[PDB]
Amino acid sequence: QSPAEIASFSPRPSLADSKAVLNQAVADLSVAHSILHQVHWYMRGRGFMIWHPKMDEYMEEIDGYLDEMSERLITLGGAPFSTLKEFSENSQLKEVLGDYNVTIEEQLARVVEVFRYLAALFQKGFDVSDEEGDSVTNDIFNVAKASIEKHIWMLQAELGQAPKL
Amino acid sequence: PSLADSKAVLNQAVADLSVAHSILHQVHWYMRGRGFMIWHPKMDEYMEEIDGYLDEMSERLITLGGAPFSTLKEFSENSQLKEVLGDYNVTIEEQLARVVEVFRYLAALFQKGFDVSDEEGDSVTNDIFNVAKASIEKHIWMLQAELGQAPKL
Amino acid sequence: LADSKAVLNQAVADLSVAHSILHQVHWYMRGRGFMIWHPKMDEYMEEIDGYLDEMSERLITLGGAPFSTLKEFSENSQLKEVLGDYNVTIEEQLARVVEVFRYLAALFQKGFDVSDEEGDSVTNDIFNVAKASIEKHIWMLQAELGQAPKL
Amino acid sequence: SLADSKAVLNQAVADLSVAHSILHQVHWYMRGRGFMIWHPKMDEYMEEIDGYLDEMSERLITLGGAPFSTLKEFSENSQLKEVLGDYNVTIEEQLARVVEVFRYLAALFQKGFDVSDEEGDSVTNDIFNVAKASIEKHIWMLQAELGQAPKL
Amino acid sequence: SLADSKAVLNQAVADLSVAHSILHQVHWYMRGRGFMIWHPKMDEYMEEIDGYLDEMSERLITLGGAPFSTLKEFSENSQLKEVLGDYNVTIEEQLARVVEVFRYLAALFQKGFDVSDEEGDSVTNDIFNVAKASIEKHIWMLQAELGQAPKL
Amino acid sequence: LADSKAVLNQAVADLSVAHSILHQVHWYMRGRGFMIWHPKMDEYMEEIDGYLDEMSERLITLGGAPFSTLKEFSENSQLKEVLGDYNVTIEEQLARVVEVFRYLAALFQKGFDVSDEEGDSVTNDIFNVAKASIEKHIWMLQAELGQAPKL
Amino acid sequence: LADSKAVLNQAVADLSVAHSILHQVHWYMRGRGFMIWHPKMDEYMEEIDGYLDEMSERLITLGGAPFSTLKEFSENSQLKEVLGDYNVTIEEQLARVVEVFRYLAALFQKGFDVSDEEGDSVTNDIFNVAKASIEKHIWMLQAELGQAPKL
Amino acid sequence: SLADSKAVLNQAVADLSVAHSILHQVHWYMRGRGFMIWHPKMDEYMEEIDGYLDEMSERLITLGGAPFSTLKEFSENSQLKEVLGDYNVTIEEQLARVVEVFRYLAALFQKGFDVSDEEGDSVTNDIFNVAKASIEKHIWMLQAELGQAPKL
Amino acid sequence: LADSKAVLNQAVADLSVAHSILHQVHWYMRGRGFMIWHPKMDEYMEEIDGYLDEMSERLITLGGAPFSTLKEFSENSQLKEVLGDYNVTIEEQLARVVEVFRYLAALFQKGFDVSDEEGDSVTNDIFNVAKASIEKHIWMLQAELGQAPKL
Amino acid sequence: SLADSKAVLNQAVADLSVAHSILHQVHWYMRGRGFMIWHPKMDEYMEEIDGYLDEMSERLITLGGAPFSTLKEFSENSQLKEVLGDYNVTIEEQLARVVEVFRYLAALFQKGFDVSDEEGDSVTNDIFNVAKASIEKHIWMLQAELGQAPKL
Amino acid sequence: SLADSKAVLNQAVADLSVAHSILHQVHWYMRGRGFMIWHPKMDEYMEEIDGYLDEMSERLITLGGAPFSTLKEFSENSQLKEVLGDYNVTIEEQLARVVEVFRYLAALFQKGFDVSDEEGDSVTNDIFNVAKASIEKHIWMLQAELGQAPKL
Amino acid sequence: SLADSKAVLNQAVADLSVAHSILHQVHWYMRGRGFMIWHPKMDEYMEEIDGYLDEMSERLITLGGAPFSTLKEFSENSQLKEVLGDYNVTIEEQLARVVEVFRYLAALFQKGFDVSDEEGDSVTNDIFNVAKASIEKHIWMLQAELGQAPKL
Ligand SMILES: [Ca+2]
Ligand SMILES: [Ca+2]
Ligand SMILES: [Ca+2]
Ligand SMILES: [Ca+2]
Ligand SMILES: [Cl-]
Ligand SMILES: [Cl-]
Ligand SMILES: [Cl-]
Ligand SMILES: [Cl-]
Ligand SMILES: [Cl-]
Ligand SMILES: [Cl-]
Ligand SMILES: [Cl-]
Ligand SMILES: [Cl-]
Ligand SMILES: [Cl-]
Ligand SMILES: [Cl-]
Ligand SMILES: [Tb+3]
Ligand SMILES: [Tb+3]
Ligand SMILES: [Tb+3]
Ligand SMILES: [Tb+3]
Ligand SMILES: [Tb+3]
Ligand SMILES: [Tb+3]
Ligand SMILES: [Tb+3]
Ligand SMILES: [Tb+3]
Ligand SMILES: [Tb+3]
Ligand SMILES: [Tb+3]
Ligand SMILES: [Tb+3]
Ligand SMILES: [Tb+3]
């Protein structure tokens, strides 16, 4: 005979170890990137000429974390999500169709939402990596969390609000 | 001459670009209102690009055996663009609206340049207009976006 | 796919999928040649992002609305992604890259054809430049694999 | 013999030190549309202000003087008044505050220009003139953002 | 009010705009041995003319004035005369036109200098001083190519 | 100094005064070594400026309100300023910088301690980076003075 | 694509010979204006070399086999070479570069036409870009020589 | 108090000096397909190694310690063993040798991390961490070229 | 090859042919290693071009008349060219380069010796620097081919 | 009409050439603790002296003058005195010597400033002013190294 | 044939390795006025020494030799002696030690020159020549700091 | 036993200084078609001459010598003779003057080369060789401009 082929529902979704949460990051950072690109492209209104370019800067920073976090996952022996289907299903951020009729304030507020989520994800990754004693991974999350939180201050300040982290 | 018209539209461009530069200088200088700090330096970027086209088009014309307009009287009399005196009381959005309008004219100019030069088989001149049109159109998108509008080319 | 705006948006989806695949090759790569090709994938991706931005933004300039969600990229792209696997050779990785680049070169030909018919010379040149470059890469990638470009 | 020149140099040291402090408060406490342009702009202004403070302090040293060099001295000799940071100053208000400070500095620099000319200190004179040039350009730009004429 | 400082700044705007046009004509129409050096040199002169033009107009704005800003205003106010482009002018003759334009500029800047000195406009006075220094150096140089003394 | 915010604001006050002392040192310096040590103060000042901005901004980020007036810096800082004097020797100037730095090293360790205990990991690493560089500067200044770092 | 491929290879022959002529002009130049024109041949040579590589590599990408020996170059090229001679005037050497450029400009027009007929838009832009630049140079050289470009 | 941290820092000075010797050996004796990529890559590794060895040695000095600083000290104290150069070794063996050196450093740097953590030396702790992060990435890449998992 | 002048001109001829051959290797290359060795042929050609210019120009300085036509290069060179072929393996290409370089080193040695005996120190230095560089390359290429330099 | 401006420019050309010569002696014959920083510093001072000499020489040409241009002219018209190099001179003495030279030049630039101001040559006046500022700053610095006030 | 050229090149590998290690000890153990200038200067020396070390071994490889490549080999073959690091050495003593090292290396490089001169290995000969020129420059400078003649 | 190498090094210091002065005169006094190119070209030559002067003097110092270091010493030991600057001299005459100085220098570097070969001073030999190579290349270029062969 032969070993039976197991048929069960996709197991994961529980952020229990460093590996798990690094992959969740790969997923969320890929979608974040896509949301950022849509804001870049669909943006209209006073303040476009400053924020259009800014989205590029954010995107590059997000790219940087995406790469180092999946590559840390690889180094630790894991297997990073690497298809749009994987990214789209494992991510907790929702995507919507691009729309040109959104005010600047609403765009910036959407980016703050995404940044708040990512900062909590990196907080979770920090805590998990600390508990498991994976100090390298721990530092990666902390660094990413530092600058995301700083971007949240600035965005909120443009919106006339405190960071409210 | 086989290339008489390429020549004529290149020189039209020389005149209109010189006028366009002038207007962008006026916007840069007379600008007042929230957004000054971003748009004032942006006019410099536009001017540098307009300048780059003015030089390239005039010199393509020289290369083809033409005599480019090279006096303010010539630019002025030949250009289809109309200049008005500077006024500090124009709003930032009216200033950007004017820039979009100058740029729309230039896109149509470069379109005609493109067609005429494609007609006469001057493929170098064709490319020059094609590159200029491409850039100007991108600029129109951005300006319109800032104005809360679609590019509407 | 019979106007410039549809071909451009199709390119948005396909370049987005091509970028994802190039990333997968970057990460899962193993074997002799890794030290040269792993970094090369970043060059390829920087380029693909280059075109993605220019095309999407040409569409916008032309009054279109780019695919801008993963669902849209995935469903609209003609490219097929598979799960990442470490157990693929460098030569196999390269061959996959060439397949994708071949697909892109052909998409760029259609964009070239369609915009030429429509008299949209700006879009036409964007497709033209992207093609010249994709084609150069296939020559080089095929050469590493000991084969002619076979365009 | 260069006593009036020395006094105005040192007065500028106090004032520039306070001005720098105010720019730093505006930079941190800024909130509202245009933050993203004006926040970094505050660094540009601070660098320049630091540039003058150092240059003028060292011109004073070079003349045989002794520049104020403590926060107490800066705060007590300066004519500018500082206030507790407040996040609810609007952008426009923040810009108007920088304008008030720059106008003060332009007038201080005028006085320094005049006094150094009177004492025949031509090097000190050109130092104030350069500073004045650039400050007035900044007032022109600030006021333009505010939709106003430079009003020098 | 600095009425004449403003008047000379605006005269400079007009004349530099015409000077710039004249240098462009020389760049384009130039033919003869020396072309390869002087053709590009015309770009360097234009960039410098451009610099003054923007600095002077911007100093005018800063002072409360309203710079000339249309080609008609440039032509009607400039003292410089423009002629149609001709390819049959020699290099030596082109260089002679430039010297003549620059001798004019240097005289204009002397007036700008004298007027701003007199009105106590030291910033403007420096702007003119810097422009005149540069222009006069160029004159020495062009004259030297032409085998002649600067004859300032 | 009740928490992370409190210590951040203390660093804001102390870094401001520390920067002022450094400028005093830069300006009133005389003696053999001037030519190396005078410009070196500029390097120290840029670094202190950097910590000052980063720490105040971390405080902003966290919902605090940084000291931002000279009175506030002066009031809250634990460093004491004295009038400039040209007759201080170069090695005496370097010793005052060492004292100021040892003070800032201590401050930053309290900062590190407090943030660690509160779980403010970003603030923690900020004080740690600051601590590392100051302690290296102490080693180098003490070395110049013929002494061990004596942390 | 036989005709596109043939004109590309022709250009390889002729650009290799043009390059050698420029190198001769560079070395054998004597007369007033040497100091401006001697380095200018280095810029011309650099640019010629860029076309040469670009055009044979295009040919490779198309599945051709570019001429690649001095024999192939001399035999296929329509340019004729003469022994070096220091007795040539500066103006004479410039006229010889003008002649050679006028020739390449014509060849590039053939290449452009042929490629346009065969639908090879990529080769077509390559010829178009080379021709834009050679013609600018001819204007400039002719102007140094007191003449209209006469294209 | 900080004796254990000082001890591991000094161990690292020793092992890093030998490591760097081994990389230089690889660099010079390398032969085979891939020489052209890997030979200069050893240079990257050496300079990164030199970087850690200076940082760590200077952190030891800063703590009041006395770094090993003679070839005899390095050899005696290093746990890494050196062998004679041999051109006959294969590229893949050369790379396997670099991996085994790095796996050792990574383990050493983890010991440093742990020791310094227990002692409260947070600066020393962060130096090992950054070192460890870097080396582990290198092991992944080196293993990748050899067709293997990182096995960390 | 009687004297310094004569060997300088000989090198102009051989360096021209060597550059030709390197370019052939750059273009016709196929197989694993292409991605590192294709661009490596650019660094080599660049270097060869440096020597060729320096050597001919030293000869002009010396009052000679450097070869300046492809006919002179081809007829005077001891190096021999073959038709381009895609079927040559990477290692064969690499070994071709080695053999050209070995010839060049031997030529430069003769150039060194000849200018030495004529007391032309400048020409001597030129051949020395050229030699040291080529031998370094020979070690490196041989290393790739799994062999000792065997000078 | 411009004779005194031309005179003091040409006197500066001579003194600047001798001063360059002196600084090069100091550079070469220097020995003593402090060499490693003061040796390269003399290069910086020489480049600056060179800049003034070229600028002032060329202002003189521009004005229709004829700069001193031989070592014999420089040596004979200079108020500065040269002696044979000697390795025994201490570092303080070397530095005190450069100060004396700088003091002379600063004074010479003051005469130049005065004279051009009288003759209304504002461009020449600015050149002397700029030169004077920088030299006085270096005097402060060298005096400070020497443990002293600038005592301008 | 080239056995003696190879042998001295290999002597150089071992000595430059030990020279580098002594420079590193000097860099780490330095204490005294001058530290902030001389500490970085040891880095520059170390860089230059590595430069020679890599080039000489690679020249050896190129010639068919096998360079020393283990700390054991460097130690055994070097004629330089190493002692434990001591903080209580003065800056002047530390510099005198470098001067001793360099004096040795320049004697070595002269032997390398003469040997290769004899064996007609003109490339190896230029390498030693370049190295010697540079080391002798540094000996002049270090000695000048020490108030001494170069005394080659 | 080193002494003639030192004497040629010192003659070079004198002649290079004089040559630097002559090039400066040509820079300033040049008039005529070609000015715009040859005027800046003199700068390049002067920077190069200063390069040699400094390297040669410092090699002399390194050898335990005492370089000429006053204008009088340069003037009286130089074989080159200076004349009063004159504007009327043609461009072609000026270049010929530089050619004549460069031929003197190449010949002097040849004597330098030979004397240092005989004395076994390889470092100095190499300095003269390098200088000679570049001077000869300039003669070619200058001669080419004047429509002549180099005639070395
Ligand atoms: Ca709405
Ligand atoms: Ca008036
Ligand atoms: Ca005391
Ligand atoms: Ca004459
Ligand atoms: Cl502006
Ligand atoms: Cl990577
Ligand atoms: Cl973009
Ligand atoms: Cl910030
Ligand atoms: Cl041009
Ligand atoms: Cl300073
Ligand atoms: Cl050359
Ligand atoms: Cl290529
Ligand atoms: Cl250090
Ligand atoms: Cl003449
Ligand atoms: Tb990566
Ligand atoms: Tb142009
Ligand atoms: Tb974009
Ligand atoms: Tb300062
Ligand atoms: Tb402006
Ligand atoms: Tb900040
Ligand atoms: Tb290529
Ligand atoms: Tb260090
Ligand atoms: Tb050349
Ligand atoms: Tb000059
Ligand atoms: Tb190496
Ligand atoms: Tb020197």
In this complex, the residue of H33, H145, H149 whose CB is nearest that of residue C34 is H145
Residue whose tokens read 């050609």: I45
Long-range contacts of K92-98 (CB under 8 A, 24+ apart): K92/K32, K92/K146, K94/K26, K94/K29, K94/K30, K94/K32, K94/K38, K95/K38, K95/K142, K95/K145, K95/K146, K96/K146, K97/K22, K97/K26, K98/K22, K98/K23, K98/K26, K98/K42, K98/K45, K98/K142
What does the alpha-carbon distance between residue D121 and residue I4 come to, in Å, rounded to a whole number?
A: 67
List b or e across I51-78, with b for residues whose CB sees 16 or more CB atoms inside 10 angstroms.
bbbbbbbbbbbbebbbbbbbebbbebbe
Determine contact: F29 vs chain J, CB below 8 A: yes
- CA of L89 relative to ligand 14 center, distance in Å: 7
List b or e across E63-79, with b for residues whose CB sees 16 or more CB atoms inside 10 angstroms.
bebbbbbbbebbbeebe
Query: CA A33 from chain center: how many Å?
Result: 7
Identity at K112, one-letter amino acid code: G
Residue whose tokens read 């032409």: E146
CB A142 within 8 A of CB F125: yes
What does the alpha-carbon distance between residue E48 and residue E28 come to, in Å, rounded to a whole number?
A: 18
For chain B, domain boundaries: 1-153
What does the alpha-carbon distance between residue H69 and residue H67 come to, in Å, rounded to a whole number?
A: 6
Q: What DSSP character marks residue J128?
A: H
Q: Across the interface, do C81 and A80 touch by the CB < 8 Å criterion?
A: no
Identity at I124, one-letter amino acid code: N
CB count within 10 Å of CB I92 equals 13
List, as one string, the DSSP characters of C100-149: HHHHHHHHHHHHHHHHHHHT-HHHHHHHHHHHHHHHHHHHHHHHHTTS--
List, as one string, the DSSP characters of C1-31: --SHHHHHHHHHHHHHHHHHHHHHHHHH--S
CB L20 within 8 A of CB L44: no
List b or e across C41-59, with b for residues whose CB sees 16 or more CB atoms inside 10 angstroms.
beebbebbbebbbbbbbbb
Long-range contacts of G106-109 (CB under 8 A, 24+ apart): G107/G7, G107/G10, G107/G11, G107/G14, G108/G11, G108/G134
Identity at L39, one-letter amino acid code: H
Q: Which residues of J touch F84 (CB under 8 A)?
A: none
Residue whose tokens read 């384009």: E28
Q: Where are the alpha helices (DSSP H) in chain H?
A: 3-29, 35-62, 71-77, 91-119, 122-146
CB D44 within 8 A of CB D23: no
Q: Which residues of J touch D126 (CB under 8 A)?
A: 126, 129-130, 133
Residue G41: phi, psi to the nearest 5? -65, -30
On whether J58 is known to bind a ligand per the annotation, the reply is: yes
∠ CA D20-D24-D30, nearest 5°, is: 140
What does the alpha-carbon distance between residue A19 and residue B46 come to, in Å, rounded to a whole number?
A: 49
Determine contact: J61 vs chain E, CB below 8 A: yes
Cα–Cα nearest to H89, from H143, H38, H141: H38
What does the alpha-carbon distance between residue D101 and residue B56 come to, in Å, rounded to a whole number?
A: 46
Determine contact: B146 vs chain A, CB below 8 A: yes
CB C44 within 8 A of CB C103: no
Q: Which residues of F touch K87 (CB under 8 A)?
A: 148
Task: Please state how this structure was obtained.
Answer: X-ray
What does the alpha-carbon distance between residue K139 and residue J16 come to, in Å, rounded to a whole number?
A: 32
Give me the architecture of the I1-151 domain, per CATH.
Up-down Bundle (1.20)
Query: Dmax of chain G from CA atoms?
Result: 48
In this complex, the residue of B62, B72, B86 whose CB is nearest that of residue E69 is B86
What does the alpha-carbon distance between residue L117 and residue L121 come to, in Å, rounded to a whole number?
A: 6
Determine contact: F28 vs chain D, CB below 8 A: yes
Cα–Cα nearest to A43, from B97, C56, B102: C56
CB count within 10 Å of CB A8 equals 5
Residue C28: phi, psi to the nearest 5? -90, -5
Identity at C12, one-letter amino acid code: V
What does the block give as tokens for E118? 């007199």
Closest ligand, as measured to the CA of F93: 3
What does the block give as tokens for B27? 């916007």
Which sign, positive or negative, has the C-alpha torsion E95, E97, E101, E107?
positive
Phi/psi zone of residue E147: left (φ > 0), alpha (ψ -120 to 50 degrees), beta? left
- CA of G61 relative to ligand 12 center, distance in Å: 11
Query: CA D142 from chain center: how many Å?
Result: 14
Q: Across the interface, do B146 and A100 touch by the CB < 8 Å criterion?
A: no
What does the alpha-carbon distance between residue C60 and residue C67 come to, in Å, rounded to a whole number?
A: 11
Taking CA atoms, what residue in A is nearest to D30? Answer: A157
In this complex, the residue of L21, L67, L85 whose CB is nearest that of residue J71 is L21
CB I86 within 8 A of CB I112: no
Residue whose tokens read 């949209």: C120
Q: Which residues of J touch E135 (CB under 8 A)?
A: none
Provide the shortest C-alpha distance from residue D113 to chain J (in Å). Answer: 15
What does the alpha-carbon distance between residue G123 and residue D79 come to, in Å, rounded to a whole number?
A: 71
Determine contact: G61 vs chain I, CB below 8 A: no
**Measuring CA to CA, how many Å separate I140 from each of I40, K61, K125, K127?**
12, 10, 21, 19
Residue range A1-165 forms a domain whose CATH class is mainly alpha
What does the alpha-carbon distance between residue H12 and residue H109 come to, in Å, rounded to a whole number?
A: 8
What does the alpha-carbon distance between residue F44 and residue F141 come to, in Å, rounded to a whole number?
A: 12
Determine contact: G149 vs chain B, CB below 8 A: yes
Phi/psi zone of residue H66: left (φ > 0), alpha (ψ -120 to 50 degrees), beta? beta
Cα–Cα nearest to C78, from C109, C54, C99, C47: C99
3-state helix, strand, coil in chain J (%, to 5): 75, 0, 25
Determine contact: I26 vs chain C, CB below 8 A: no
What does the alpha-carbon distance between residue J45 and residue J50 come to, in Å, rounded to a whole number?
A: 8
What does the alpha-carbon distance between residue K117 and residue K113 come to, in Å, rounded to a whole number?
A: 6
User: Helix or strand or coil: residue G105?
Assistant: helix
Statement: D1-152 belongs to CATH 1.20.1260.10: yes
List b or e across L91-129, with b for residues whose CB sees 16 or more CB atoms inside 10 angstroms.
beebbbbbbebbbbbbebbbebbbbbbebebbbbbbbbb
CB K122 within 8 A of CB K62: no
Residue whose tokens read 């789209």: A88
Phi/psi zone of residue D64: left (φ > 0), alpha (ψ -120 to 50 degrees), beta? left
Kindly tell me the burial class for residue A110, based on how many C-beta atoms sit within 10 Å of its own C-beta (0-12, 13-18, 19 or more): middle
Size of interface A-B (CB pairs under 8 A): 26
Rg (CA), chain C: 16
Cα–Cα nearest to H126, from H15, H7, H9: H9
Determine contact: J84 vs chain K, CB below 8 A: no
Provide the shortest C-alpha distance from residue H65 to chain F (in Å). Answer: 10
Residue window 96-125, chain J: list those with CB within 8 Å of chain L: none
Total residues belonging to chain L: 152
Q: Across the interface, do H62 and F150 touch by the CB < 8 Å criterion?
A: no
Q: Where are the alpha helices (DSSP H) in F62-147?
A: 70-76, 90-118, 121-144
Residue I71: phi, psi to the nearest 5? -60, -55
Spell out the residues 6+ positions from residue J26 whose beta carbon is closer than 8 angstroms to its own. Answer: J42, J94, J97, J98
Gap between the terminal Cα atoms of chain K: 31
CB G16 within 8 A of CB G25: no
Rg (CA), chain L: 16
Rg (CA), chain F: 16
Residue whose tokens read 């770009």: E43
List, as one string, the DSSP characters of D53-120: HHHHHHHHHHTT-----SHHHHHHH-S-------TTS-HHHHHHHHHHHHHHHHHHHHHHHHHHHHTT
Provide the shortest C-alpha distance from residue A129 to chain H (in Å). Answer: 14
On whether B28 is known to bind a ligand per the annotation, the reply is: yes
Cα–Cα nearest to J8, from J134, J105, J102, J152: J105
Statement: B1-153 belongs to CATH 1.20.1260.10: yes
Helix (H) or strand (E) holding C79: none
Cα–Cα nearest to F7, from F118, F137, F133: F118
Helix (H) or strand (E) holding G62: none
Q: Across the interface, do E85 and B62 touch by the CB < 8 Å criterion?
A: no
What does the alpha-carbon distance between residue H60 and residue H58 come to, in Å, rounded to a whole number?
A: 5
Query: CA I97 from chain center: how many Å?
Result: 9
Kindly tell me the burial class for residue B77, based on how many C-beta atoms sit within 10 Å of its own C-beta (0-12, 13-18, 19 or more): exposed
Provide the shortest C-alpha distance from residue J123 to chain E (in Å). Answer: 6
**Measuring CA to CA, how many Å separate G115 from each of G124, G129, H120?**
5, 14, 73
Spell out the residues 6+ positions from residue E4 whose beta carbon is closer than 8 angstroms to its own. Answer: E115, E118, E119
Q: Which residues of K touch J31 (CB under 8 A)?
A: 143-145, 147-148
Identity at L105, one-letter amino acid code: L
CB count within 10 Å of CB G87 equals 8
Q: What is the 3-state secondary structure (H, E, C) of L98-137?
A: HHHHHHHHHHHHHHHHHHHHHCCCHHHHHHHHHHHHHHHH
Question: In a mutagenesis test of the G interface, which of B123, B125, B128, B130 is the best target, namely the one with the most G β-carbons within 10 Å?
Answer: B123
Q: Which residues of D touch E119 (CB under 8 A)?
A: none
Query: What's the resolution in A?
Result: 2.1
Total residues belonging to chain H: 152
Question: In a mutagenesis test of the K interface, which of I129, I136, I141, I142 is the best target, namely the one with the most K β-carbons within 10 Å?
Answer: I136
Identity at J79, one-letter amino acid code: Q
What does the alpha-carbon distance between residue I5 and residue A31 come to, in Å, rounded to a whole number?
A: 69
List b or e across H73-108, with b for residues whose CB sees 16 or more CB atoms inside 10 angstroms.
bbbeebebebeebeeebebeebbbbbbebbbbbbeb
**Measuring CA to CA, how many Å separate A113 from each of A107, A152, B123?**
10, 9, 51
**Measuring CA to CA, how many Å separate J90 from each of B30, J21, J39?**
63, 19, 13
What does the alpha-carbon distance between residue K51 and residue K105 come to, in Å, rounded to a whole number?
A: 14
Query: CA L140 from chain center: how many Å?
Result: 15
- CA of F53 relative to ligand 20 center, distance in Å: 5
- CA of E16 relative to ligand 13 center, distance in Å: 55
List b or e across K64-88, with b for residues whose CB sees 16 or more CB atoms inside 10 angstroms.
ebbbbbbbbbbbeebebebeebeee
Determine contact: C23 vs chain A, CB below 8 A: yes
**Measuring CA to CA, how many Å separate L108 from each of H57, L9, L149?**
52, 10, 21
Total residues belonging to chain E: 152
Residue whose tokens read 């994961």: A12
Taking CA atoms, what residue in A is nearest to C55? Answer: A41
∠ CA E23-E28-E31, nearest 5°, is: 110
Helices I90-117 & I4-28 angle (0-180, nearest 10): 170
Spell out the residues 6+ positions from residue C84 whose beta carbon is closer than 8 angstroms to its own. Answer: A79, A80, A82, A83, C24, C27, C28
Residues with CB under 5 Å of ion ligand 16 are B 55
**Measuring CA to CA, how many Å separate D139 from each of D131, E56, L140?**
13, 16, 58
Residue B91: phi, psi to the nearest 5? -75, 160
Q: Where are the alpha helices (DSSP H) in C29-120?
A: 34-61, 70-76, 90-118
Kindly tell me the burial class for residue B78, based on how many C-beta atoms sit within 10 Å of its own C-beta (0-12, 13-18, 19 or more): middle
Determine contact: K36 vs chain J, CB below 8 A: no
What does the alpha-carbon distance between residue E131 and residue F123 come to, in Å, rounded to a whole number?
A: 52
CB A55 within 8 A of CB A40: yes
Total residues belonging to chain J: 152
Determine contact: C86 vs chain H, CB below 8 A: yes
Q: Which residues of J touch E132 (CB under 8 A)?
A: 122-123
Residue whose tokens read 């030949």: B78
Which sign, positive or negative, has the C-alpha torsion D13, D15, D21, D24?
negative
Q: Which residues of I touch H31 (CB under 8 A)?
A: 143, 146-147
What torsion do the CA atoms of C133, C137, C142, C145 make, to the nearest 10 degrees? 180
What does the alpha-carbon distance between residue F113 and residue K24 come to, in Å, rounded to a whole number?
A: 35
